[PDB]
Amino acid sequence: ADAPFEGRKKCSSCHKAQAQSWKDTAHAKAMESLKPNVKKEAKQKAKLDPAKDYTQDKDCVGCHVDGFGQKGGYTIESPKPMLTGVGCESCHGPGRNFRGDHRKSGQAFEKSGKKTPRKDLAKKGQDFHFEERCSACHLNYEGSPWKGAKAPYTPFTPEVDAKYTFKFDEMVKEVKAMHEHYKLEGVFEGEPKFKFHDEFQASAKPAKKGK
Ligand code: HEM
Ligand code: HEM
Ligand code: HEM
Ligand code: HEM
């Protein structure tokens, strides 16, 4: 019983600093790349049509939106702006079930300092590991080292250009590709905890924008 996707809106309303930074990332602009005449040079190199409209192409949208083919996720028939672009749930997991726990646990902490185990969030679908999710978009090509690969494949592979080589441990540390990291008070605790969480929090910026 995995959880349904719902879109970025509620996440962004509670996490304004991360949302503001995420908006400037290539992930947030992913659907723009599928539009005609955008990234013409890159498309030519990959032997795609620079003038074609790929925004409703099922061979392309799944890696440029949230939750394609998944419950509550993006559909070409009724495409939600809040699921357009690679958004919050594409990395952190579909949020319909865990988002309410962020609200309740946040209120419990503000009122009484009570912390909540991350295990409770993982049970509700939140992802604290990320690698498989990033890989399903970035390493989904024929003969890829990632064994979950299956069509449709990304046209942007190491064969096309070495700049498309993907190494999770390196790229998850590119803030300009994730979003800047801001300091957490520590409402959630324990495992499963992302392997680089303490590192990211140790150099995180202070609560910038919102509250
Ligand atoms: C939308 C589904 C959504 C996402 C995505 C999201 C992510 C998120 C992360 C990654 C954390 C950190 C967890 C950890 O410590 O490992 C986090 C923490 C908090 N959130 Fe959140 N969050 C989403 C939605 C919401 C909503 C709608 C609210 C507000 C009602 C909210 C609140 C919080 C709070 C509070 C925390 C703890 C912050 C702290 O300082 O420790 N989130 N969220
Ligand atoms: C998982 C945490 C994850 C990582 C790590 C990751 C990295 C990453 C980088 C470094 C880029 C390049 C950014 C830039 O050049 O400015 C990038 C770009 C795209 N990604 Fe990604 N990405 C992660 C996760 C995901 C997921 C889950 C998907 C598919 C739903 C995905 C897709 C894309 C796409 C598409 C781009 C390009 C956007 C564009 O320019 O149109 N990524 N990612
Ligand atoms: C479908 C034919 C399709 C199109 C069209 C498309 C376009 C596209 C562009 C223009 C980019 C940016 C490349 C650049 O160098 O700036 C881009 C990037 C990524 N895509 Fe995409 N894409 C199409 C399909 C798919 C599919 C089916 C997947 C996932 C299986 C996918 C994934 C990605 C990823 C990952 C990137 C980022 C590459 C990087 O910069 O590292 N795309 N796409
Ligand atoms: C979508 C706009 C979005 C939100 C909202 C969001 C929130 C969020 C929080 C609150 C954290 C913890 C504090 C911090 O700033 O580090 C957090 C951490 C990570 N995120 Fe995130 N995040 C949003 C989008 C995305 C996207 C699209 C990706 C993947 C390309 C991504 C990845 C990460 C990673 C990795 C971390 C570190 C996790 C940790 O330290 O526990 N986020 N995000």
mmCIF file with all atom_site columns, N, CA and C in Angstrom, residues 95-130:
data_model
loop_
_atom_site.group_PDB
_atom_site.id
_atom_site.type_symbol
_atom_site.label_atom_id
_atom_site.label_alt_id
_atom_site.label_comp_id
_atom_site.label_asym_id
_atom_site.label_entity_id
_atom_site.label_seq_id
_atom_site.pdbx_PDB_ins_code
_atom_site.Cartn_x
_atom_site.Cartn_y
_atom_site.Cartn_z
_atom_site.occupancy
_atom_site.B_iso_or_equiv
_atom_site.pdbx_formal_charge
_atom_site.auth_seq_id
_atom_site.auth_comp_id
_atom_site.auth_asym_id
_atom_site.auth_atom_id
_atom_site.pdbx_PDB_model_num
ATOM 1   N N  . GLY A 1 95  ? 3.501  12.144 -1.132 1.00 0.00 ? 95  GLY A N  1
ATOM 2   C CA . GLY A 1 95  ? 3.218  12.738 0.177  1.00 0.00 ? 95  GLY A CA 1
ATOM 3   C C  . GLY A 1 95  ? 1.824  12.779 0.716  1.00 0.00 ? 95  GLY A C  1
ATOM 4   N N  . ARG A 1 96  ? 0.867  12.145 0.045  1.00 0.00 ? 96  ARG A N  1
ATOM 5   C CA . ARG A 1 96  ? -0.460 12.270 0.609  1.00 0.00 ? 96  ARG A CA 1
ATOM 6   C C  . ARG A 1 96  ? -0.604 11.794 2.058  1.00 0.00 ? 96  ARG A C  1
ATOM 7   N N  . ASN A 1 97  ? 0.084  10.720 2.434  1.00 0.00 ? 97  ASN A N  1
ATOM 8   C CA . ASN A 1 97  ? -0.022 10.141 3.766  1.00 0.00 ? 97  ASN A CA 1
ATOM 9   C C  . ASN A 1 97  ? 0.957  10.739 4.760  1.00 0.00 ? 97  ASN A C  1
ATOM 10  N N  . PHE A 1 98  ? 2.146  11.124 4.317  1.00 0.00 ? 98  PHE A N  1
ATOM 11  C CA . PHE A 1 98  ? 3.071  11.644 5.314  1.00 0.00 ? 98  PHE A CA 1
ATOM 12  C C  . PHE A 1 98  ? 2.965  13.111 5.588  1.00 0.00 ? 98  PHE A C  1
ATOM 13  N N  . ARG A 1 99  ? 2.397  13.893 4.677  1.00 0.00 ? 99  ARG A N  1
ATOM 14  C CA . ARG A 1 99  ? 2.352  15.330 4.841  1.00 0.00 ? 99  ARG A CA 1
ATOM 15  C C  . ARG A 1 99  ? 1.568  15.749 6.078  1.00 0.00 ? 99  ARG A C  1
ATOM 16  N N  . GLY A 1 100 ? 0.522  14.986 6.399  1.00 0.00 ? 100 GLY A N  1
ATOM 17  C CA . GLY A 1 100 ? -0.282 15.302 7.591  1.00 0.00 ? 100 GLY A CA 1
ATOM 18  C C  . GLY A 1 100 ? 0.516  15.049 8.861  1.00 0.00 ? 100 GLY A C  1
ATOM 19  N N  . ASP A 1 101 ? 1.436  14.068 8.854  1.00 0.00 ? 101 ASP A N  1
ATOM 20  C CA . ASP A 1 101 ? 2.323  13.768 9.992  1.00 0.00 ? 101 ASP A CA 1
ATOM 21  C C  . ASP A 1 101 ? 3.331  14.950 10.142 1.00 0.00 ? 101 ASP A C  1
ATOM 22  N N  . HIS A 1 102 ? 3.758  15.587 9.038  1.00 0.00 ? 102 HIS A N  1
ATOM 23  C CA . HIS A 1 102 ? 4.685  16.753 9.196  1.00 0.00 ? 102 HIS A CA 1
ATOM 24  C C  . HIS A 1 102 ? 3.940  17.848 9.968  1.00 0.00 ? 102 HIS A C  1
ATOM 25  N N  . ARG A 1 103 ? 2.650  18.054 9.659  1.00 0.00 ? 103 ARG A N  1
ATOM 26  C CA . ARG A 1 103 ? 1.848  19.075 10.358 1.00 0.00 ? 103 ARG A CA 1
ATOM 27  C C  . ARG A 1 103 ? 1.638  18.681 11.822 1.00 0.00 ? 103 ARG A C  1
ATOM 28  N N  . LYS A 1 104 ? 1.194  17.464 12.058 1.00 0.00 ? 104 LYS A N  1
ATOM 29  C CA . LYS A 1 104 ? 0.936  17.069 13.451 1.00 0.00 ? 104 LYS A CA 1
ATOM 30  C C  . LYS A 1 104 ? 2.201  16.999 14.315 1.00 0.00 ? 104 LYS A C  1
ATOM 31  N N  . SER A 1 105 ? 3.268  16.462 13.740 1.00 0.00 ? 105 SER A N  1
ATOM 32  C CA . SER A 1 105 ? 4.514  16.326 14.498 1.00 0.00 ? 105 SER A CA 1
ATOM 33  C C  . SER A 1 105 ? 5.118  17.693 14.725 1.00 0.00 ? 105 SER A C  1
ATOM 34  N N  . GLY A 1 106 ? 4.961  18.610 13.784 1.00 0.00 ? 106 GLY A N  1
ATOM 35  C CA . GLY A 1 106 ? 5.456  19.975 13.925 1.00 0.00 ? 106 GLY A CA 1
ATOM 36  C C  . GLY A 1 106 ? 4.700  20.664 15.076 1.00 0.00 ? 106 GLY A C  1
ATOM 37  N N  . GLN A 1 107 ? 3.388  20.482 15.102 1.00 0.00 ? 107 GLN A N  1
ATOM 38  C CA . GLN A 1 107 ? 2.563  21.053 16.193 1.00 0.00 ? 107 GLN A CA 1
ATOM 39  C C  . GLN A 1 107 ? 2.934  20.409 17.523 1.00 0.00 ? 107 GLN A C  1
ATOM 40  N N  . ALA A 1 108 ? 3.151  19.093 17.567 1.00 0.00 ? 108 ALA A N  1
ATOM 41  C CA . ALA A 1 108 ? 3.538  18.423 18.843 1.00 0.00 ? 108 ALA A CA 1
ATOM 42  C C  . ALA A 1 108 ? 4.876  18.980 19.336 1.00 0.00 ? 108 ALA A C  1
ATOM 43  N N  . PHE A 1 109 ? 5.816  19.158 18.415 1.00 0.00 ? 109 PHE A N  1
ATOM 44  C CA . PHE A 1 109 ? 7.101  19.725 18.819 1.00 0.00 ? 109 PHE A CA 1
ATOM 45  C C  . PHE A 1 109 ? 6.951  21.199 19.309 1.00 0.00 ? 109 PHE A C  1
ATOM 46  N N  . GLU A 1 110 ? 6.226  22.041 18.594 1.00 0.00 ? 110 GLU A N  1
ATOM 47  C CA . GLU A 1 110 ? 6.071  23.432 18.994 1.00 0.00 ? 110 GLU A CA 1
ATOM 48  C C  . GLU A 1 110 ? 5.384  23.517 20.351 1.00 0.00 ? 110 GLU A C  1
ATOM 49  N N  . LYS A 1 111 ? 4.434  22.620 20.622 1.00 0.00 ? 111 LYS A N  1
ATOM 50  C CA . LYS A 1 111 ? 3.706  22.719 21.895 1.00 0.00 ? 111 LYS A CA 1
ATOM 51  C C  . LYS A 1 111 ? 4.347  22.057 23.060 1.00 0.00 ? 111 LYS A C  1
ATOM 52  N N  . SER A 1 112 ? 5.120  21.009 22.814 1.00 0.00 ? 112 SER A N  1
ATOM 53  C CA . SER A 1 112 ? 5.715  20.254 23.901 1.00 0.00 ? 112 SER A CA 1
ATOM 54  C C  . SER A 1 112 ? 7.080  19.704 23.712 1.00 0.00 ? 112 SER A C  1
ATOM 55  N N  . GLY A 1 113 ? 7.733  20.036 22.597 1.00 0.00 ? 113 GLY A N  1
ATOM 56  C CA . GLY A 1 113 ? 9.081  19.562 22.362 1.00 0.00 ? 113 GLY A CA 1
ATOM 57  C C  . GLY A 1 113 ? 9.209  18.076 22.022 1.00 0.00 ? 113 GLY A C  1
ATOM 58  N N  . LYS A 1 114 ? 8.078  17.438 21.724 1.00 0.00 ? 114 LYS A N  1
ATOM 59  C CA . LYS A 1 114 ? 8.047  16.014 21.431 1.00 0.00 ? 114 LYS A CA 1
ATOM 60  C C  . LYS A 1 114 ? 8.636  15.809 20.038 1.00 0.00 ? 114 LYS A C  1
ATOM 61  N N  . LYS A 1 115 ? 9.503  14.817 19.908 1.00 0.00 ? 115 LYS A N  1
ATOM 62  C CA . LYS A 1 115 ? 10.096 14.494 18.602 1.00 0.00 ? 115 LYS A CA 1
ATOM 63  C C  . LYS A 1 115 ? 9.354  13.280 18.053 1.00 0.00 ? 115 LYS A C  1
ATOM 64  N N  . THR A 1 116 ? 9.472  13.032 16.746 1.00 0.00 ? 116 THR A N  1
ATOM 65  C CA . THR A 1 116 ? 8.743  11.894 16.151 1.00 0.00 ? 116 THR A CA 1
ATOM 66  C C  . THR A 1 116 ? 9.750  11.073 15.377 1.00 0.00 ? 116 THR A C  1
ATOM 67  N N  . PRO A 1 117 ? 9.669  9.732  15.457 1.00 0.00 ? 117 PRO A N  1
ATOM 68  C CA . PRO A 1 117 ? 10.625 8.914  14.713 1.00 0.00 ? 117 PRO A CA 1
ATOM 69  C C  . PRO A 1 117 ? 10.441 9.018  13.193 1.00 0.00 ? 117 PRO A C  1
ATOM 70  N N  . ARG A 1 118 ? 11.559 9.097  12.467 1.00 0.00 ? 118 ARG A N  1
ATOM 71  C CA . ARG A 1 118 ? 11.478 9.102  10.992 1.00 0.00 ? 118 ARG A CA 1
ATOM 72  C C  . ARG A 1 118 ? 10.843 7.778  10.535 1.00 0.00 ? 118 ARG A C  1
ATOM 73  N N  . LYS A 1 119 ? 10.952 6.718  11.353 1.00 0.00 ? 119 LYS A N  1
ATOM 74  C CA . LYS A 1 119 ? 10.332 5.443  10.958 1.00 0.00 ? 119 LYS A CA 1
ATOM 75  C C  . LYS A 1 119 ? 8.844  5.634  10.680 1.00 0.00 ? 119 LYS A C  1
ATOM 76  N N  . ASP A 1 120 ? 8.182  6.478  11.475 1.00 0.00 ? 120 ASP A N  1
ATOM 77  C CA . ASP A 1 120 ? 6.764  6.733  11.273 1.00 0.00 ? 120 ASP A CA 1
ATOM 78  C C  . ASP A 1 120 ? 6.531  7.334  9.897  1.00 0.00 ? 120 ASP A C  1
ATOM 79  N N  . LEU A 1 121 ? 7.425  8.226  9.451  1.00 0.00 ? 121 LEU A N  1
ATOM 80  C CA . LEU A 1 121 ? 7.297  8.844  8.121  1.00 0.00 ? 121 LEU A CA 1
ATOM 81  C C  . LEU A 1 121 ? 7.631  7.853  7.021  1.00 0.00 ? 121 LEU A C  1
ATOM 82  N N  . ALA A 1 122 ? 8.641  7.013  7.231  1.00 0.00 ? 122 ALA A N  1
ATOM 83  C CA . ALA A 1 122 ? 9.009  6.039  6.188  1.00 0.00 ? 122 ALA A CA 1
ATOM 84  C C  . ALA A 1 122 ? 7.833  5.069  5.978  1.00 0.00 ? 122 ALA A C  1
ATOM 85  N N  . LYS A 1 123 ? 7.116  4.751  7.065  1.00 0.00 ? 123 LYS A N  1
ATOM 86  C CA . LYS A 1 123 ? 5.981  3.836  6.958  1.00 0.00 ? 123 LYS A CA 1
ATOM 87  C C  . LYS A 1 123 ? 4.882  4.428  6.094  1.00 0.00 ? 123 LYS A C  1
ATOM 88  N N  . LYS A 1 124 ? 4.808  5.764  6.036  1.00 0.00 ? 124 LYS A N  1
ATOM 89  C CA . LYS A 1 124 ? 3.804  6.465  5.289  1.00 0.00 ? 124 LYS A CA 1
ATOM 90  C C  . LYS A 1 124 ? 4.285  6.884  3.902  1.00 0.00 ? 124 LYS A C  1
ATOM 91  N N  . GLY A 1 125 ? 5.428  6.320  3.489  1.00 0.00 ? 125 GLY A N  1
ATOM 92  C CA . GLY A 1 125 ? 5.937  6.543  2.157  1.00 0.00 ? 125 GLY A CA 1
ATOM 93  C C  . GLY A 1 125 ? 7.086  7.530  1.963  1.00 0.00 ? 125 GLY A C  1
ATOM 94  N N  . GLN A 1 126 ? 7.539  8.178  3.026  1.00 0.00 ? 126 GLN A N  1
ATOM 95  C CA . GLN A 1 126 ? 8.601  9.173  2.778  1.00 0.00 ? 126 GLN A CA 1
ATOM 96  C C  . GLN A 1 126 ? 9.911  8.448  2.501  1.00 0.00 ? 126 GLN A C  1
ATOM 97  N N  . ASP A 1 127 ? 10.700 9.041  1.577  1.00 0.00 ? 127 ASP A N  1
ATOM 98  C CA . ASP A 1 127 ? 11.977 8.468  1.169  1.00 0.00 ? 127 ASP A CA 1
ATOM 99  C C  . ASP A 1 127 ? 13.114 9.215  1.861  1.00 0.00 ? 127 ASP A C  1
ATOM 100 N N  . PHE A 1 128 ? 13.977 8.452  2.540  1.00 0.00 ? 128 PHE A N  1
ATOM 101 C CA . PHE A 1 128 ? 15.162 9.019  3.167  1.00 0.00 ? 128 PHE A CA 1
ATOM 102 C C  . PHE A 1 128 ? 16.427 8.477  2.565  1.00 0.00 ? 128 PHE A C  1
ATOM 103 N N  . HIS A 1 129 ? 16.346 7.842  1.375  1.00 0.00 ? 129 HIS A N  1
ATOM 104 C CA . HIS A 1 129 ? 17.508 7.224  0.782  1.00 0.00 ? 129 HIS A CA 1
ATOM 105 C C  . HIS A 1 129 ? 17.744 7.806  -0.613 1.00 0.00 ? 129 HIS A C  1
ATOM 106 N N  . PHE A 1 130 ? 16.650 8.008  -1.349 1.00 0.00 ? 130 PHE A N  1
ATOM 107 C CA . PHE A 1 130 ? 16.667 8.670  -2.662 1.00 0.00 ? 130 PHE A CA 1
ATOM 108 C C  . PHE A 1 130 ? 17.290 8.010  -3.913 1.00 0.00 ? 130 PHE A C  1
#
